[PDB]
Structures are given as structure tokens and as C-alpha cells.
């Protein structure tokens, strides 16, 4: 069924790719095939002299380290964030703003951003005194781990996709990737958003009508927010995709809750299956986190993101209308 897969992959540049269908068609290799497709589209193998076999080996290794038993934070979510970042990077307001190295950083960061996620929160890991919380001194535990695993896997057999980048490129790439993935810790959300707003308030556009970004701080800020948006893009996708995501995160939160209950721990917010309001929580999530983020983003790239914002709003109303009264 190589052809049905290939047809589905033609939508790689569109918001709302059917990533679950691609996961099925590809034999649960959504991250591998989507990354590969994206790297060919953007000509990254040629530009950075990445042997195609090294790329595929790395991708399969990377995908293998997402957990098949985790319902949300798995290779499908990783594939989704990659493809979403890929669309955001193609927004007219950002045309020719970012270098190829910057583009590679954003996409690689998206690919690795949740790798080896155990399906529980930083707080659970801190409360149980896990080795991970210990090694990372309780700070952005999962996120530091995602990075270290992602880079560490480059050392497996025929996995070094950066073998042909100069040392200066590698150092620049590594810095950008690190800055991006640490920004995906939800505890950094408010500060990211605050900085995004500031940038929007003093927004400058170029002669050619694209965003002006003068310095590393402004550049990396946008890339961080871009990937953060991709990470928080579920409520902005067609409703049939959104609802599957919602099912999956709830399943994952509810397993954590069960685990906290059987261990005698305080149950985390939204993790109690006996005490849950899925719909109301989605509305809350939209009102207080997702819509504030996407509206600010939409202002930065005005009017590129208007349809994404409209769908966000249609979807909020759907969940509002589905709250048990
Ligand atoms: C941190 O919170 C997240 C993270 C990722 C997703 C993804 C899809 C989604 O449907 O909601 C998400 C939420 C909010 C969930 C609830 C319980 C309000
Ligand atoms: Zn994460
Ligand atoms: Zn994520």
C-alpha cells in the first residue's frame, strides 16, 4: 500500500494532515516517513550532506525510543509536532527569515522534543525521587532528558546525521536545539508568552513584508514560540483530529492519576478519572493557554494564521456545547 501512503504524504505542507492515518499506513512509522518527506522537500540532505541511510537509521532509532504504550507522548505526537512546525516555518510572514541551519534546528528539536517520555509529569518524577529528577536537580527534568536522549542516539551505529556539519555549525545547531526544547516545559509558558507579546508590540517588518529579526535573542524567541505553538496545536486542528488528541491525553493523565492513587500520592489536576470534566477542561485550556498563545502568534504573522485561529474558536464552542449541564 506504498501508494496510498504516498498520496497521504502529499498533504505534508497542510495544516490538518491526517497523522493517525499516516501512522497506520506506514506501519507505525509516522515520525520516520514524515521527517524523511520533510527533509527531501526542504533539500536538507543535500544542503547538509546527510547520507540518506544515516538519516533513515537515525529516524528509526529516534522513533523506536518513543514509547508505544504511552497514549499521548509517543511517536505520533512527535510526528505531529514536526509537521506542524514545518507548516509554521512556511508561513508567508517568515519567508526567507531563517537560515537553513535554523530551519534544521527547529525541525530536529520538534522531532526529539518528547523522546523517551515515560507518560508522567515532571512533578511525579520529582515526588518519587526518580534517578531522572536526581540527575537533573528537579529542573525541567523530562525536557533535559528528551534533549540528552535525542543527542545521545546520534552515537548509535550509522546514526550521526550531523557528521558533515562544520564544528561551528554543530555548535550553533546544538545551542538552538537546546534552547528550543527547554522552552517546551509548560512552566516556561507565561514568560514565553510575555516575551512574544512584547515582540508583537514592537513588531518590525522588512521591505519585502516579512518579520525583521535583528539578533539571536529575537530569532530564538520566535523559534521557541513556534515550536511551543506546534506543541500546543491540537485544539487548532480539524475537530476529528482534535478529539483523538483529547482522548489520548486524557487516557495518559488518567493512568498517571491511577498511579498516584495506588501509591497514596495527591492526585494531579485533571488526572482523576472519578472526578473529571473533560469538556470543561478543554474549554479552560483553550481560554487560558491555547487561545492567548495562538492569538499573539496570529498577530505576529498577521494575517497568515487567521484560519487556524477560526478553527480554534469553532472547536472551543464544540466542547462548550458538550459540557454536561
Ligand atoms: C498540558 O496540558 C495539555 C497538553 C497537551 C494537550 C494536547 C491535547 C489536548 O487535548 O489537551 C492537552 C492539554 C490539556 C489537557 C487537559 C486535561 C486540560
Ligand atoms: Zn514535552
Ligand atoms: Zn510535546
From Swiss-Prot:
Q: Where does Mg(2+) bind?
A: 114
Residues that, per the record, bind Zn(2+) 1 = 77, 113-114, 231
Positions that bind AMP: 73, 114, 231, 234, 282, 285
Q: Where is the active site?
A: 73 (proton donor)
PDEase domain location: 1-325
Query: Could you say which residues bind Mn(2+) here?
Result: 114
Q: Name one GO cellular component term.
A: nucleoplasm
What's the chief localization of this chain? Answer: membrane
* Domain of life of the organism encoding this protein: Eukaryota
Q: Where does Zn(2+) 2 bind?
A: 114
Q: Supply the alphabetized keyword list.
A: cAMP, Cell membrane, Cytoplasm, Cytoskeleton, Disease variant, Hydrolase, Isopeptide bond, Manganese, Membrane, Metal-binding, Phosphoprotein, Ubl conjugation, Zinc
Task: State where 3',5'-cyclic AMP binds.
Answer: 73, 282, 285
Respond yes or no to whether keyword Transmembrane is given for this record.
no
What does UniProt note about where in the body, tissue by tissue, this protein is expressed? Expressed in colonic epithelial cells (at protein level). Widespread; most abundant in skeletal muscle.
User: Where does it live in the cell?
Assistant: Apical cell membrane; Cytoplasm; Membrane; Cytoplasm, Cytoskeleton
Query: Which family is this sequence assigned to?
Result: Belongs to the cyclic nucleotide phosphodiesterase family. PDE4 subfamily.
Q: How does it assemble?
A: Homodimer for the long isoforms. Isoforms with truncated N-termini are monomeric. Isoform 3 is part of a ternary complex containing PRKAR2A, PRKAR2B and AKAP9. Interacts with PDE4DIP. Identified in a complex composed of RYR1, PDE4D, PKA, FKBP1A and protein phosphatase 1 (PP1). Isoform 5, isoform N3 and isoform 12 bind RACK1 via their unique N-terminus. Binds ARRB2. Interacts (via N-terminal region) with SHANK2 (via proline-rich region); the interaction is increased in a PKA-dependent manner.
The record's function comment reads: Hydrolyzes the second messenger cAMP, which is a key regulator of many important physiological processes.
Query: What disease involvement is noted?
Result: Genetic variations in PDE4D might be associated with susceptibility to stroke. PubMed:17006457 states that association with stroke has to be considered with caution. Acrodysostosis 2, with or without hormone resistance: A pleiotropic disorder characterized by skeletal, endocrine, and neurological abnormalities. Skeletal features include brachycephaly, midface hypoplasia with a small upturned nose, brachydactyly, and lumbar spinal stenosis. Endocrine abnormalities include hypothyroidism and hypogonadism in males and irregular menses in females. Developmental disability is a common finding but is variable in severity and can be associated with significant behavioral problems.
- Name of the protein: 3',5'-cyclic-AMP phosphodiesterase 4D
Q: Which organism is it from?
A: Homo sapiens (Human)
Amino acid at each position: 500500500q506504498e501508494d496510498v501512503l504516498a498520496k497521504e504524504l502529499e498533504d505534508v505542507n497542510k495544516w490538518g494532515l491526517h497523522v493517525f492515518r499516516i501512522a497506520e499506513l506506514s506501519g507505525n512509522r509516522p515520525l520516520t516517513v514524515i521527517m524523511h518527506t520533510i527533509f527531501q522537500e526542504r533539500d536538507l540532505l543535500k544542503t547538509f550532506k546527510i547520507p540518506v541511510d544515516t538519516l533513515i537509521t537515525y529516524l528509526m532509532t529516534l522513533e523506536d525510543h518513543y514509547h508505544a504504550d504511552v497514549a499521548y507522548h509517543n511517536n505520533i505526537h512527535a510526528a505531529d509536532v514536526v509537521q506542524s512546525t514545518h507548516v509554521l516555518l512556511s508561513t508567508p510572514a517568515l519567508e526567507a527569515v531563517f537560515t537553513d541551519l535554523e530551519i534544521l534546528a527547529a525541525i530536529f528539536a520538534s522531532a526529539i522534543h518528547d523522546v523517551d517520555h515515560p507518560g508522567v509529569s515532571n512533578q511525579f518524577l520529582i515526588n518519587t525521587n526518580s534517578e531522572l529528577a536526581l540527575m537533573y536537580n528537579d529542573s525541567s527534568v523530562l525536557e533535559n532528558h528528551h534533549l540528552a536522549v535525542g543527542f545521545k542516539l546520534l552515537q548509535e551505529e550509522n546514526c550521526d546525521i550531523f557528521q558533515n556539519l562544520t564544528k561551528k555549525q554543530r555548535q550553533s545547531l546544538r545551542k538552538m536545539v537546546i534552547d528550543i526544547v527547554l522552552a517546551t516545559d509548560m512552566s516556561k509558558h507565561m514568560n514565553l508568552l510575555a516575551d512574544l507579546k512584547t515582540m508583537v508590540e514592537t513588531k518590525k517588518v522588512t521591505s519585502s513584508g516579512v518579520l525583521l529579526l535583528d539578533n539571536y535573542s529575537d530569532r530564538i524567541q520566535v523559534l521557541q514560540n513556534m515550536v511551543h505553538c506546534a506543541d500546543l496545536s491540537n485544539p487548532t486542528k480539524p475537530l476529528q483530529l482534535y478529539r483523538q488528541w483529547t482522548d489520548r491525553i486524557m487516557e495518559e493523565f488518567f493512568r498517571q492519576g491511577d498511579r498516584e492513587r495506588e501509591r497514596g500520592m495527591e492526585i494531579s489536576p485533571m488526572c482523576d478519572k472519578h472526578n473529571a470534566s473533560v469538556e470543561k477542561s478543554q474549554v479552560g485550556f483553550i481560554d487560558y493557554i491555547v487561545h492567548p498563545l495562538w492569538e499573539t502568534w496570529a498577530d505576529l504573522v498577521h494575517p497568515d494564521a487567521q484560519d487556524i485561529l477560526d478553527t480554534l474558536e469553532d472547536n472551543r464552542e464544540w466542547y462548550q456545547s458538550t459540557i454536561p449541564q
